[PDB]
Write an enzyme that holds these catalytic residues in place. Structure first.
Site, PDB file in Angstrom:
ATOM      1  N   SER A  44      -1.203  -5.142   4.668  1.00  0.00           N
ATOM      2  CA  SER A  44       0.151  -5.770   4.608  1.00  0.00           C
ATOM      3  C   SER A  44       0.181  -7.308   4.471  1.00  0.00           C
ATOM      4  O   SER A  44      -0.183  -7.837   3.422  1.00  0.00           O
ATOM      5  CB  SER A  44       1.064  -5.256   5.738  1.00  0.00           C
ATOM      6  OG  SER A  44       0.343  -5.033   6.931  1.00  0.00           O
ATOM      7  N   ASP A 104       2.219   0.783   2.903  1.00  0.00           N
ATOM      8  CA  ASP A 104       1.545  -0.022   3.931  1.00  0.00           C
ATOM      9  C   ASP A 104       0.279   0.700   4.444  1.00  0.00           C
ATOM     10  O   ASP A 104       0.315   1.890   4.782  1.00  0.00           O
ATOM     11  CB  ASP A 104       2.552  -0.346   5.074  1.00  0.00           C
ATOM     12  CG  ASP A 104       1.886  -0.903   6.366  1.00  0.00           C
ATOM     13  OD1 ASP A 104       1.018  -1.800   6.275  1.00  0.00           O
ATOM     14  OD2 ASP A 104       2.265  -0.465   7.489  1.00  0.00           O
TER      15      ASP A 104
END
Ligand code: NA
Ligand code: NA
Lengths: 248, 249
Positions: A39, A144
């Site tokens: 991320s 993610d």
């Protein structure tokens, strides 16, 4: 001399502390040979891998509007392409300024997806595709990488590094009083499995390696009102270990 | 003779296969001394612990309507469970039911495993069944479906002092790419992923003595109650097949 890999754990707002770690590491003359990120660790680490200076990363973070899932998905993709326009004709991530891996999750199968080639922007956008904030991306439907490898120590070690500097910005659990909605409960679940894979990787750290854990007690995971503090947090946390990082 | 603990994995629709396992086990004269269950495994196993016969469990499953919103279903589920269990009101210790029983749930605030062993059977079973986005959590700790921490509670059952475990894994199939339409879909998938990971871990701890039952549920939708009779038959047949191996307990 030892090959040093920098691992940048996942987050969102909290991952801007990564900038301050870079800022310290550069000041201290610590040379990074490999970067692995999820991320926000992937955004900051990816831009840095591409050639940005921590100072410019800081300037960019202090001068832009952090003020539906698909529209934000495109907006994030266009920002990333702008920042990275200089690496268009790149394809192999090992041939950036610094070798770089982003980490993502195949939502269909749960498998870890490590990018090592292709379009830097698109890969970084995959790693950053936090459910209920940015639509997943199709490259495999991808999200993610926090839910499978939030602190990708093992990814960085498969780039052949001898030592890792790991930055854990933490994924605090929400308090009982903040769990209002159904979305809140499920984020909490994702946070729980994120921590579990995080703790597992942190378990594999050796004598040689260095864990950096910025003081982010206050800090909201999505709260971009305190950028300067976030960056300072990573800066100071790293400055404190100047002695221990010196022996690399 | 060995003490036999029955572990009933979590699910929803798929957990009605548990009924058919009980139905077989009873037929085969296998005596259960302890039961541990999550979600549906906790409903079926809890009602059975309290004194229901698998036949009556089957009749109840074939004759009821599986046809702000999370909370209304939460109350509805609680009133059904209280009706079915009205005979165990004055119970408090779960070890003193017909069969000793533990339900398993998750403290959503801290991620800790919560094993109930006392209190109000209905309320506890309702905690174990509180699947996020289907039934509101319950306050006893704010509590949810125990699938995310111990979906196949082998270790819970072994802390009741059993020597052997019969484990029923009904599986938590992942959704396919084509079915992942909405944001809710992606997050359920995440929950499924961590559910399997703790499931695989417990299944790892099974020994020579123990018996794994894994019903053929290839077709079966996790929330699909249109095929109850098949679900129960699945657990029935899967267990009937191991009659020989269960015989040596
Ligand atoms: Na394609
Ligand atoms: Na695809």
């Amino acid at each position: 001399r030892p090959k040093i890999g920098l691992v940048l754990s996942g987050g969102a707002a909290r991952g801007l502390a990564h900038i301050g770690v870079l800022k310290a590491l550069d000041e201290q003359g610590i040379q990074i040979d490999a970067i692995a990120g999820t991320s926000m660790g992937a955004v900051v680490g990816g831009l840095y891998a591409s050639g940005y200076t921590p100072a410019e990363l800081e300037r960019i973070a202090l001068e832009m509007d952090w003020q539906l899932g698909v529209i934000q998905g495109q907006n994030l993709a266009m920002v990333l392409e702008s920042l990275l326009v200089h690496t268009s004709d790149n394809r192999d991530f090992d041939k950036l300024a610094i070798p770089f891996r982003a980490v993502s999750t195949d939502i269909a199968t749960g498998e870890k997806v490590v990018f090592r080639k292709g379009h830097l922007p698109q890969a970084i956008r995959a790693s950053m595709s936090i459910p209920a904030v940015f639509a997943p991306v199709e490259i495999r439907l991808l999200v993610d990488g926090g839910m499978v490898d939030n602190i990708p120590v093992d990814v960085a070690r498969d780039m052949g590094v001898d030592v890792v500097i790991v930055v854990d910005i933490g994924n605090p659990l929400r308090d009982r009083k903040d769990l209002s909605t159904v979305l809140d409960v499920m984020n909490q679940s994702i946070t729980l499995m994120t921590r579990k894979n995080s703790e597992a990787q942190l378990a594999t750290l050796k004598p040689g390696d260095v864990l950096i854990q910025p003081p982010l007690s206050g800090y909201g995971t999505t709260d971009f009102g305190r950028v300067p503090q976030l960056i300072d947090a990573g800066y100071r946390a790293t400055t404190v270990l100047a002695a221990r990082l010196a022996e690399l």
